[PDB]
Amino acid sequence: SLRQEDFPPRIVEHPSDLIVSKGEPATLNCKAEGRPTPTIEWYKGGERVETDKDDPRSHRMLLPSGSLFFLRIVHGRKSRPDEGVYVCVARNYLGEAVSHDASLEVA
Amino acid sequence: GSLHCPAACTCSNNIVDCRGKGLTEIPTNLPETITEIRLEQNTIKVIPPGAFSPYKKLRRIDLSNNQISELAPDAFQGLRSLNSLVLYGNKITELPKSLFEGLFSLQLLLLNANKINCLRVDAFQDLHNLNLLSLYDNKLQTIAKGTFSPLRAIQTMHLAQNPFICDCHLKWLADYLHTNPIETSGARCTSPRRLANKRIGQIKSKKFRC
């Protein structure tokens, strides 16, 4: 008929550059195919991003789609945890896929 | 078949991506097999009668960052597979009766960053599988008792950046939030003076008085 065998991850939607203002919501998307369903991790400037799934205390959520949802962009005079260049990595037992960069910039 | 992919969009494996294309209306005549429609960052003002009803395999509708001020009550009528509806960053002031009727499968509903000034007690009547509800950054002064009763699967809620009046009519919410510690954004009273700037979750229920 048409079987789906296990296969390693492939990014089918890369995050895209985003311009946002302080206090506004933002999403960076990351759709990966793979079986078993790949798990998604986010990195900002090469450093792993903490989300509700690593800390329940958060303005950042990792949604079941793999998307990184910012309920509100934090950008104070002297505190800027959200602006940066992001990559998502999708993993399953057969391999991993790394997305293109996406810049999250505050206007 | 004939062509069912709008030229402004790309259609890949039933995902239709129309983001950031300066669209003022939802493209019509999409593939009947569509599972995801991505319309974020356009200039759509109105969601017309039965807009999404034909697309029975839709799992995800993203309309974030448009200019939506009006949605037809039957815009999502007859969708039984819809998993995620994202509407944040629009200009929505009210949700008509029946807007979310029949969305039994819905798991994610992002309504944050609008101008919603009132919610109907039946607004989420059928949303028994909803896991995340975001109402953050709207114009709600109250939520009617019973509005959250249908939300049997709810895990996370955002209610903050709403000008709540923490009187007797919001007492149920203090109770609700003490029994269900699922509100993560820090919902706060705007009035009365005694409760101004205090998290609803931090206030003893007795203090909610008319």
Side-chain angles (χ1 to χ4, degrees), chain A residues 2-56 58-77 79-107, chain B residues 1-90 92-208 210:
Chain A
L2 176 49
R3 82 198 99 202
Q4 186 56 69
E5 292 303 318
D6 289 354
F7 68 108
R10 181 189 40 259
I11 311 299
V12 298
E13 176 187 358
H14 296 83
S16 52
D17 292 352
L18 189 61
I19 295 164
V20 61
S21 290
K22 193 197 327 189
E24 298 178 341
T27 304
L28 299 170
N29 297 281
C30 177
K31 187 187 261 86
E33 285 171 12
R35 171 183 214 90
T37 312
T39 55
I40 302 298
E41 284 174 292
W42 286 92
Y43 295 87
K44 186 191 74 178
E47 298 276 283
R48 176 77 173 298
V49 179
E50 295 161 323
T51 71
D52 65 348
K53 295 311 164 203
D54 325 308
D55 51 58
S58 81
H59 69 302
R60 293 191 208 111
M61 297 175 75
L62 178 62
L63 302 179
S65 62
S67 295
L68 175 68
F69 173 49
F70 297 82
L71 175 63
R72 58 188 189 90
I73 293 297
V74 179
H75 176 85
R77 160 82 190 278
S79 174
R80 295 170 198 200
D82 295 336
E83 294 148 72
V85 175
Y86 286 81
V87 184
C88 71
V89 175
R91 284 189 181 83
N92 66 197
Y93 84 93
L94 289 168
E96 76 164 33
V98 183
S99 73
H100 306 148
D101 285 352
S103 61
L104 179 57
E105 282 168 26
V106 171
Chain B
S2 59
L3 176 62
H4 296 105
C5 189
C9 311
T10 63
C11 303
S12 326
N13 185 38
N14 290 312
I15 287 151
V16 177
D17 183 353
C18 293
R19 301 177 285 153
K21 290 295 182 279
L23 308 179
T24 52
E25 58 222 324
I26 302 164
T28 52
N29 189 42
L30 298 168
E32 61 170 1
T33 48
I34 189 180
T35 64
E36 175 176 318
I37 178 73
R38 306 286 297 285
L39 286 156
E40 55 263 57
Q41 294 157 290
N42 284 289
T43 57
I44 292 160
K45 287 174 158 76
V46 176
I47 309 297
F52 299 100
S53 296
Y55 306 111
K56 307 306 187 177
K57 280 163 160 171
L58 277 174
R59 296 188 244 244
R60 176 176 181 184
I61 290 171
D62 198 324
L63 284 156
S64 53
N65 289 320
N66 279 268
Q67 288 168 27
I68 296 161
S69 64
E70 173 179 58
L71 303 98
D74 67 344
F76 306 110
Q77 183 169 91
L79 296 183
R80 293 290 179 282
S81 299
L82 190 69
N83 168 263
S84 117
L85 178 51
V86 178
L87 282 157
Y88 69 68
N90 284 289
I92 302 170
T93 54
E94 49 187 34
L95 303 176
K97 176 174 178 175
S98 305
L99 186 73
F100 304 128
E101 169 181 69
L103 301 177
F104 297 102
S105 279
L106 197 68
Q107 293 197 277
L108 160 68
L109 178 56
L110 307 185
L111 288 165
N112 52 299
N114 279 283
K115 305 288 176 194
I116 294 166
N117 60 42
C118 188
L119 281 177
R120 293 177 55 89
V121 73
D122 65 13
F124 313 120
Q125 190 54 62
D126 293 337
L127 313 185
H128 307 121
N129 284 315
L130 201 61
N131 283 343
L132 163 61
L133 170 64
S134 193
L135 289 165
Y136 177 85
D137 189 7
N138 273 292
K139 298 306 190 145
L140 292 169
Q141 285 186 305
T142 199
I143 302 173
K145 185 173 161 53
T147 303
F148 301 156
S149 308
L151 303 178
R152 295 200 284 282
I154 197 75
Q155 293 308 291
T156 302
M157 208 178 262
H158 307 139
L159 299 182
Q161 299 291 337
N162 282 286
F164 292 118
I165 300 169
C166 292
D167 61 13
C168 67
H169 307 296
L170 216 62
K171 190 192 213 303
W172 75 266
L173 182 59
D175 292 326
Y176 178 92
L177 291 177
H178 167 100
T179 169
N180 306 281
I182 65 179
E183 199 297 302
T184 60
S185 66
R188 263 165 220 281
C189 308
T190 285
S191 61
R193 283 190 326 301
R194 336 101 205 44
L195 304 178
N197 206 22
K198 304 192 171 308
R199 297 156 181 274
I200 298 173
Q202 289 316 79
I203 308 163
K204 290 172 87 283
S205 312
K206 40 169 260 179
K207 319 197 106 48
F208 286 69
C210 296

